[PDB]
Each structure stands twice: as structure tokens, then as C-alpha cells.
Amino acid sequence: AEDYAKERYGISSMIQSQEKPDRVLVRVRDLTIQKADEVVWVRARVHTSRAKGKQCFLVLRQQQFNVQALVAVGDHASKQMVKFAANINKESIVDVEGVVRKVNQKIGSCTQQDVELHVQKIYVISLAEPRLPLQLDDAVRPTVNQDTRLDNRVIDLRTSTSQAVFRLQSGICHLFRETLINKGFVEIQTPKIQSPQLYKQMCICADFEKVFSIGPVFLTEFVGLDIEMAFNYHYHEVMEEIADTMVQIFKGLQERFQTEIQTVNKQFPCEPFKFLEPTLRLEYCEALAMLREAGVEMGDEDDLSTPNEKLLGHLVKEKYDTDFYILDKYPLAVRPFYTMPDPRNPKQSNSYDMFMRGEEILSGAQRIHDPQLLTERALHHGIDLEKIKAYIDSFRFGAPPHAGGGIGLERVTMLFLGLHNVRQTSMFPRD
Amino acid sequence: AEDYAKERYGISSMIQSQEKPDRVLVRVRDLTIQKADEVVWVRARVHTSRAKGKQCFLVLRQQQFNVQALVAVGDHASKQMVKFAANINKESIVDVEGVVRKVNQKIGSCTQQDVELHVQKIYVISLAEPRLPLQLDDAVRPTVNQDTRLDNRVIDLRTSTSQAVFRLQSGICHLFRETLINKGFVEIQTPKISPQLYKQMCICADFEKVFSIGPVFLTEFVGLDIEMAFNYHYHEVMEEIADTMVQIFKGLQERFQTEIQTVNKQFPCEPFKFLEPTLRLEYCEALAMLREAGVEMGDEDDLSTPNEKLLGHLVKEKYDTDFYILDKYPLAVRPFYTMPDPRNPKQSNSYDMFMRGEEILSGAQRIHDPQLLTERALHHGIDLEKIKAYIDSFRFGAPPHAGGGIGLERVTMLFLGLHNVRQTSMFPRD
């Protein structure tokens, strides 16, 4: 009845844009010592809460960042307000007005360690229902299984790890596009109703020259970042561009996303990703030699098995101190019909895979731009020419020599951070 | 022994990466007066050619740009070489070596008008078959039907108009992402087995500012989508969306002028107009405007297409803009997730945006409250059972949020004043 702090708290009216307050909401991550003794408004989630005596301690979380808030009986809060605060369901969103105060000793369990928020006002703007299916702290500790997490995506995506993973994942897309655009590339929009490659090659035959696409690829669905490029005389022109683009991504991530890399590292310990400048390139023959030295028995025209890729990747990592490299000149026999044969060594092909942490992320080649040869290769592979006639015909009115290849975003995210399986890098996994 | 030019021209071996020549191939766009009297190597398409006497003129095309080249009996080329050049099938790709020469009359049929290429060497690196299904000059004149042009896509995409259209379209995507990212957005990848559900999940998962680009749906177009938590009023988002479009329009007009002109030539279009900041009109104001024009409309009626088109014309005449916002549509014509106006309950916190009198975006503040969402869903006669998981995502705290999306082809088409969306779709299927 009496309570003096009544106007300073509670659950507020649903936000329906009835007003535009004159008010600045500061980000948790900007609660530093620079703001000491300033009054601020903060919107955050109630991560957790504890109360004793005349005090309520809260952890206020904004994504990756979190801060301590204290509600204490005095000039601002009544004991009624303290109690209200202590009872706010976890994951509720609150608007808090408080003074930023320096603390004598660092608040070790928060990202904002040098200050705390002394609450003068606190309103629940969105009340969470009491039954949390998942606890955020559980979800991030190095227990919560694949199942509940995948069942409760909205909750799991809130964790500092999840935020880090997908913010970085968006960083990969951004970096890929920007690098490609600055190299003169044009983004294209492939339909899905005839796999991304057919269209990219069409665009090359249509004078596009440098193209990329980013989109669903398919009963599994994933996200492919695809490159196709006309070149002057040698496919190494394209191979090198692709490798350099990967390198710009790794550079950019380590320069701009260090905070998220360190966040994921806290849950899933991983050595920083290593790469050379320029990229290491090895020929198939050298790989065969290395594997044989390790006592692996392999034919000169065999494909690399997964276990052998992993070993070679370990060998390369030991020998060259790199997690990223290109393997070039695969046997023509293991590659797809549209693959250009090697002109010096006719057993081999103008084709390449690239690997991260000993796992294949890209499989490209110089394509065959000549109708006759393409047809000849297709015949050798037993392909019915009738069902690929439209594809072959697209090269008959002049086509430039070209090459390309693509990556899977989730895959590249998983390997860069050294995660357990792609599911850990798919926002909406199935299943 | 008659042909002195034998080594200078011919059909070259198939490019199979058998060599890395020390050779720089210069872009046709770079052939200018600045390069006069330089020897250069150029790779290009034989767009057209003509021959008489001791001379062969070719138009060498490298995408949007083209240059005139001259093979002529002299120190380098023989009669034989001239004859060979004269017989290269159109659309073949050639590697040409030649000197850049200042010409005194503008070569007004080319983009490179100040210079021509005096050929010293010419090789076909890719020989085109003889009978083209489609002539490129026909497909760009204010002639070729939509029909042969969809059958022979690879050829059609080659026209200076297709090049300009799709280069600019890629530029739209770029500017859309870039602006949003600078405003702090995160790109998300939504599955296709619509993005709205998923965008709202991310907002409920504390991502705050998400966008997605990808296929939308029995037709498929490309969607550029935004969703954004805000502080107190959905105008915070509406403004961010409108401003993103402003950044797109500006960047196109700054950086894609030659491609805008290329399309203008084939399909005349007044330059696209917009205000800074974006014009916003409320529903009531639009009704008043339409009534003055003699249209009869109920207060809670949805804007018909003919009525949008008229309204667009009216705002163009009065405010001099091709882009505007209409705010506060009636609640009854909007989707169940649309938040009602807290002040006028017949209206809603919803908006459409228009380019040249046609709708490109339809957004609202969404309902981030489980109870109200459910009510509203009931009102719309939706089975709560089949949207259960959607509602359930708002049960654990959600911020107030708004969003809206555009169609890429549609926005390209309306910016350029084009006739239909097929013109702006790279791979159409009827």
C-alpha cells in the first residue's frame, strides 16, 4: 500500500509502440570503468538472481556479455522492490536504470568486471514463463545433450557459445563475399526447383567471368559458398584466387572475431587455426610418397580415403605447420567427367582438393570448355548424352577456359573452431 | 613463300593449362587514349566483323565494353591473315595482339571511342559454331522474342542489357548486406524444408538484428529479409529498413551509372527519385488523397493494386518521390502476428513500402507476447496446435521486434522501370 518505490519497478505494459521515450539504452558490453558514476538505462536478460537481507544480486546478460546488478534498500529501492527483483523469472527481459559503480575487486564471473550496476529502477518488459527447459550455464559447460538442445533452439541459441559460433559464421559469409567482390566477382542467384555448378558455368559461358553464389545445397541440406572463374592460360590462376580467398577469411576471423573465437575456445578447447602465406600446394605424387613412408599401401591412381586424408593432414601439419593446404593433380579416373585432363601427365587431371584440419573442404578443377572433349569424357563415364545435351550445347558458341569449386559453410565453421560435428555449426539442424 | 604472317594468327591449341605465359591481357574498358601506341594483348569475343579489299574490321567485345579492331595487309598481317580474321565466326573468343591507335573521328558505335586496335596477331582460343540462335544486336534494340531468349539463355545473358541488369542486381545484394552489417546486423541461414519463423526465432534467441538472403515461395524469387528487435517503437525498425533502401538507391546511382544508362537506352526510364529521409504517410492521409481523386474506399479496406498505383502517382506528383512508406494499415487486412495500434485499435503497427507505385515491402511490429499472439491467432481462425512451437518460442522472454522483406528481381525491375520480372531474373521458368 505504502511502498515508496512503487513507480520505480514492476512488470510494465506490453510494448506496443505507444511512445518514443527520450532515453538512451546502453549495451552491457559498454559497461566499463569509463562510465563510472554515470546513470544509464540498460535492457538485458535476467541471467540469474540471488537475494539476502536487504539485497538482490542479478546477472544481466546481453548476448556474449554480462554484468552484475545490485538492488539494495535505500534512497531508490524499497524492500518491496528488492523482493520483486529477487523473484523475476530467469530469461525475463528487463529495463534497468542504475548508476555504474567501480568495484574494489574484479567481478570474475562476468565479462564486465570493473563495475557493477546499482539499480534505481527495474521493469520487466518481457516476462519469461517459469519452466526453463534448459539452463544456459549447463549448455556452455565443457550436462546438456544434443537432444534437449536441438529441441529447444531458441534457448540454446542464446548461449555465449552459440552467439559466438553464429556471429562468426556470418563473419565468414561477409569475408568470402567482400574478398570476392574486391577481386571483381559478381554474385549470382541460382535457382532451386541443375546444381549450383551448372548455372555458374552457364554464367561463365555468358561472359560473366567471375562468379560466386551462396545458398542452400541438397536428403541433406547445407550452405555452399561457390566460386567459378574464367582464367587466361592456367587453372592455377583460379586455384590461387580460391586459396587466397580462404586465407582472407582466416585472417579476417582472427583479426575481427577474436572475442568469439576465445568464447568457443572456453567450451571446446582448440589450438588457433594455422595457415601459410601463400598457401601450401602439394602434388598428388608427393602425397602418395608421404603416405607410403608412413607404411600406407596405395595405388598411384587410387582416390584418397578419409582416413588417408586425415593422416596426410596430420603429416602436413607436422611437416609444414599448417592446418590449410591444397592437394593438386588427382587421377583423372577419380574425378568427374567435366574435369580437364592434365596435358603433360595424361593419367592425372587439372583438379585439386583443399583441406582444413585434415578434412576436405573443397574439391575443384579446370572444367572442359570444349564441346567435343566434354562429350568424349562423358562417353567414357557412361553418361547418357541426351540428358546432358543442353549442358554440352552451352559451350558450343564460344566458351573461355575456366575453373572453380565450393565450400560448405557449416563444415568450414566446424573445422576452423575444431568442433565435433557440423551440428554444432548449423543454426537450425535437422536432425 | 607467300604467307609471311603464318605464325601470327590461327587456331590455337585448346587451353589445357599446359603453360603460364608472361603476358598481360588488358581489359577492353582500359583501351583509351592513355594507352596510345602501346602494344597490348586483349582477349575478347568477335561481336561482329566486316571485310573488303585489304582490310578486316572487327568489333571486339568484352562484356559491356567493345572496341574496333583493324587487320590490314601490311608489315604484320598478310592477305591470308586478313582473310582468316574475316572468317572467324561471331561469338568466337580470340586473343589479339595489336597497337592502340588514336583515331580522329569518334567510333560512336563502340564504348571505346577514341582508339582502335591495329592487329599484329589474332588467335581463336574458342571457336563458336556457325549458326547463332540469337543475334546480340537484335536483343538490345528498342528483334528478339522473350521466347527464343529463354531458350538460349547463355547467348541472351551476353547482351549489354543482360550484363548491366545482372551486374547491378549483384550490386543491390552487396549494398543491402553492407549497409545492414554496418548497422550491426547478423546474417542468418534459413532452411528451405519461410524465413519469417526462423528470423523470429533468432530474435527470441537474442540475435537482435538479423537478415537473410535466399529463395522464397508455386513460384520462386529471391528474398532479402530483415528482422529487428527495437527499444520502444517499431518506427526504429521501419526507419532502418527505409534507410537501407536509401543507401541502396544512392549506391546504385553513384557506382552503377553506366549500367543504369545501358538499360535506359533499351528501356527508357526516368531516374529513380527518393527523399532524405523517406517520406512516410499514414493510412488516413492516403484515403483522403484517393477520395480527392474520386476513388470510393472504406476506412478498413485494403489498398487494391490499381489504387496503389494511383497513390504512387499522387505522391510522385506532390512529393517528387518514387519511394515512400504507407503506415498504419487496418488490423483486419494484416496477418495474425501483426501488433494492433495501442491508440487506434482498428489500425495496426504495420507498413508497406513502394517503388514507382508498386509494393516492394510489407512489414509490421510483430506480437512478442504468447497470450496476445494466441488470441489473434484465434481471431484469424488458426489451429493453435499447428503453430504451437512458434508461439512457444515467445514464452521465455522475447523483445518487441519488427521486420519486412523485398524481392530482389522485383526491386531491380522497378528501379530500372522495367516491364516484368522476367527481365530481371537470370534463370526464369515460366
Burial of A153 (0-12, 13-18, 19+ CB in 10 A): buried
Query: Side chain identity at B333, as an amino acid letter?
Result: V
> Hey, what's the cell of A278?
601463400
How many Cβ atoms from other residues are within 10 Å of residue A116's Cβ?
22
C-alpha cell at A270: 582448440
Q: What are phi and psi of B148, to 5 degrees?
A: -70, -30
Q: How many residues does chain B have?
A: 430
CA-to-CA dists, residue B100 to A143, B35, B79, B113, B125, angstroms: 72, 6, 21, 12, 21
Q: Under DSSP, is residue B248 helix (H, G, I), strand (E, B) or coil?
A: helix
Helix (H/G/I), strand (E/B), else coil: B298 = coil
* Chain B CB within 8 Å of residue A245 CB: no
Q: Is B365 an interface residue toward A (CB < 8 Å)?
A: yes
**Residues A247, A412: Cα–Cα separation, whole Å:** 12
Q: What is the C-alpha end-to-end distance of chain A, expressed in Å?
A: 53
Which residue is associated with the grid cell 542479478?
A: A58
DSSP category for residue B421 = G
Residues 6 or more apart from A56 whose CB is under 8 A from it?
A49, A50, A70, A71, A72, A82, A83, A85, A86
Is residue A313 within 8 A of residue A324, CB to CB? The reply is: no
Residues B296 and B301: their CA atoms lie apart, in Å, by 10
Cα–Cα distance between B50 and B65 in angstroms, integer? 19
DSSP state of B427: S
Distances (CA, A) of A50 to A44, A73, A132: 17, 15, 17
Nearest-angstrom CA–CA distance, A347 and A350? 10
C-alpha cell at A208: 560473366
A287 phi and psi angles, rounded to 5 deg: -65, -50
In this structure, what is the dihedral angle of CA atoms A160, A162, A167, A171, given to the nearest 10 degrees? 130
Angstrom distance (rounded) from CA B113 to CA B67: 7
Amino acid at B378: L
Residue B160 carries which side chain, given as an amino acid letter?
A: S
Per CB-CB distance under 8 Å, the chain B contacts of A158 are 205-206
Determine whether the interchain pair A17/B400 forms a contact, defined as Cβ–Cβ distance below 8 Å: yes
What is the pairing mode between strands B115-126 and B93-102?
A: antiparallel
Contact B250, B162 (CB under 8 A): no
Question: Residues B119, B70: contact at Cβ < 8 Å?
Answer: yes
> If DSSP states are collapsed to H, E and C, what string results for chain A?
CCCCCHHHEEECCCCCCCCCCCCCECCHHHCCHHHCCCEEEEEEEEEEEEEECCEEEEEEEECCEEEEEEEEECCCECHHHHHHHHCCCCCCEEEEEEEEEECCCCCCCCCCCCEEEEEEEEEEEECCCCCCCCCHHHHHCCCCCHHHHHHCHHHHCCCHHHHHHHHHHHHHHHHHHHHHHHCCCEECCCCCCCCHHHHHHHHHHCCCCEEEEEEEECCCCEEEEEEEEECCCCCHHHHHHHHHHHHHHHHHHHHHCHHHHHHHHHHCCCCCCCCCCCCEEEEHHHHHHHHHHCCCCCCCCCCCCHHHHHHHHHHHHHHHCCCEEEEECCEHHHCCCCECECCCCCCEECEEEEEECCEEEEEEEEECCCHHHHHHHHHHCCCCCHHHHHHHHCCCCCCCCEEEEEEEHHHHHHHHHCCCCHHHHCCCCCC
Residue type, B363: G
For B209, counting Cβ atoms within 10 Å of its Cβ (0-12 exposed, 13-18 middle, 19+ buried), the class is buried
Cβ neighbours of A121 (radius 10 Å): 19
Whole-angstrom Cα distance, residue A70 to residue A120? Answer: 9
Residues of chain A contacting residue B45, judged by C-beta atoms under 8 Å apart: 207, 398
Q: Which amino acid is at B59?
A: V
Distance CA A60, CA B58 (A): 71
Binary contact (A233, B15; C-beta < 8 A): yes
Q: Rounded to 5 degrees, what are φ and ψ at A25?
A: -95, 120
Q: How many other CB atoms are found less than 10 A from the CB of residue A24? A: 8
Closest CA to B152 of B91, B71, B193, B231: B91
Which of B30, B182, B232 best probes binding to A when mutated, by most A CB atoms within 10 angstroms?
B232
How many Å apart are CA B385 and CA B399, to the nearest integer? Answer: 24
Start-to-end C-alpha separation, chain B: 59
Contact, A345 vs A300, CB < 8 A? no
- Percent of residues in chain B assigned helix, strand, coil, to nearest 5: 35, 25, 40
Residues facing A148 on adjacent strands: none
Q: How far is CA B305 from CA A308, B65, B328, B363, in A?
A: 62, 40, 18, 17
Chain B touched by A294 (CB under 8 Å):
no
In single-letter form, the type of residue at position A85 comes to A
Of B396, B198, B392, B208, nearest in space to A63 by CA? B208
Query: Measuring CA to CA, which residue among B152, B47, B127, B84 is closest to residue A372?
Result: B127
Residues of B in contact with A97 (CB under 8 A): none
Half-sphere exposure of A412 (CA within 13 A, CB side): 26
CA distances from A428 to A162, A165, A263, B152, B191 (A): 12, 13, 21, 38, 7
Which neighbouring-strand residues pair with B68? Answer: B59
Q: How far is CA B388 from the centre of its chain?
A: 38
- How far apart are the C-alpha atoms of B282 and B187, rounded to whole Å? 31
Helix, strand, or coil here: B33? Answer: helix
Chain A's closest residue to B42, CA to CA, is A232
Decide if B399 and A174 are in contact by the 8 Å CB cutoff: no
The torsion region of residue A416 among left (phi > 0), alpha (psi -120 to 50) and beta comes to alpha
Crossing angle of helices A258-267/A236-256, nearest 10°?
Answer: 80
**How many Å apart are CA B185 and CA A55, to the nearest integer?**
37
Distance from C-alpha of A247 to C-alpha of A189, rounded to nearest angstrom? 25
Residues A415, A274: contact at Cβ < 8 Å? no
Phi and psi of A245, rounded to 5°? Answer: -70, -45
Query: Chains A and B: how many Cβ contacts under 8 Å?
Result: 227
Select from A170, A192, A234 the Cβ nearest to the Cβ of B19.
Answer: A234
The answer to whether A360 is a known ligand-binding residue is: yes
Q: Are A189 and B395 in contact (CB < 8 Å)?
A: no
Distance CA A155, CA A148 (A): 10
- A-chain residue closest to B168, CA distance: A186
Residues in A 190-229 with any Cβ partner in B closer than 8 A: 190-193, 199, 202-203, 205-209, 214-216, 219, 221, 223
Closest CA to B55 of B81, B77, B82: B82
Rounded Cα gap, residues B177 and B183, in angstroms: 10
What is the distance in angstroms between the Cα of B191 and the nearest Cα belonging to chain A? 7
Q: What DSSP designation does B348 have?
A: B
Three cell numbers at B285? 492521409
Contact B374, B383 (CB under 8 A): no
Q: What distance in Å separates residue A104's CA from the closest CA in chain B?
A: 31
Q: For chain A, which domains are there? A: 1-132 (2.40.50.140), 133-431 (3.30.930.10)
Gap between the Cα atoms of B238 and B363, Å rounded: 8
DSSP B262: H
Backbone angles phi, psi at A42, to 5 degrees: -130, 135
Cell match 595482339: residue? Answer: B97
Collect all residues of chain A within an 8 Å Cβ-Cβ radius of residue B232: 15, 17, 19-21, 23
Alpha helices in B152-220 (DSSP H): 153-156, 160-182, 195-204
Nearest Cα residue to A200 out of A186, A218, A217 = A186
Query: Which chain A residues contact residue B327 at CB under 8 A?
Result: none
Say how many CA atoms lie within 13 Å of A77 toward its Cβ. 28
Is B18 an 8 Å CB contact of chain A? yes
Q: Does B403 touch chain A (CB under 8 A)?
A: no
Q: What are the start-end ranges of the H helices in B256-403? A: 257-266, 283-292, 305-319, 370-379, 388-392
Rounded to whole angstroms, the Cα distance separating A88 from A10 reads 9
Distances (CA, A) of A96 to A124, A128, A429: 9, 16, 35
CA A302 to chain centre: 33
Evaluated on CA atoms B98, B102, B105, B108, the torsion sign reads positive
The 10 Å Cβ neighbour count of residue B89 is: 16
CA separation for the pair A350, B334 (Å, rounded): 56
The torsion of the CA quartet B209, B215, B216, B221, rounded to 10 degrees, works out to 120
> What's the full length of chain A, in residues?
431
Q: Kindly tell me the sign of the dihedral angle through the C-alpha atoms of A166, A60, B402, A125.
A: positive
Q: What is the rounded CA–CA span in Å between residue A12 and residue A94?
A: 9
List residues bridging with B404 in a β-sheet.
B226
Q: Tell me, letter by letter, the H, E, C secondary structure of A357-425.
A: CCEEEEEEEEECCCHHHHHHHHHHCCCCCHHHHHHHHCCCCCCCCEEEEEEEHHHHHHHHHCCCCHHHH
Put simply, whether B280 touches A (Cβ < 8 Å) is no
Q: Specify which residues B44 forms β-bridges with.
A: B94
Cell of B146: 522473350
Task: Estimate the crossing angle of helix B235-255 against helix B257-266, to 10 degrees.
Answer: 80
Here the cell at position A263 is 568464447
Q: Is A409 annotated as a binding residue?
A: yes
CB contact under 8 A, B157 and A208: yes
Interface subset of A 105-124, CB within 8 angstroms of B: none
Helix axis angle for A160-182 and A409-417, nearest 10°, is 120
Helices B305-319 and B283-292, axial angle in degrees (round to 10): 90
Out of B17, B125, B128, name the one closest to residue A234 (CB).
B17
- What cell was used for B227? 528482422
CA distance B131 to B135: 10
Experimental method: X-ray
Helical (H) or strand (E) element with B143 = none
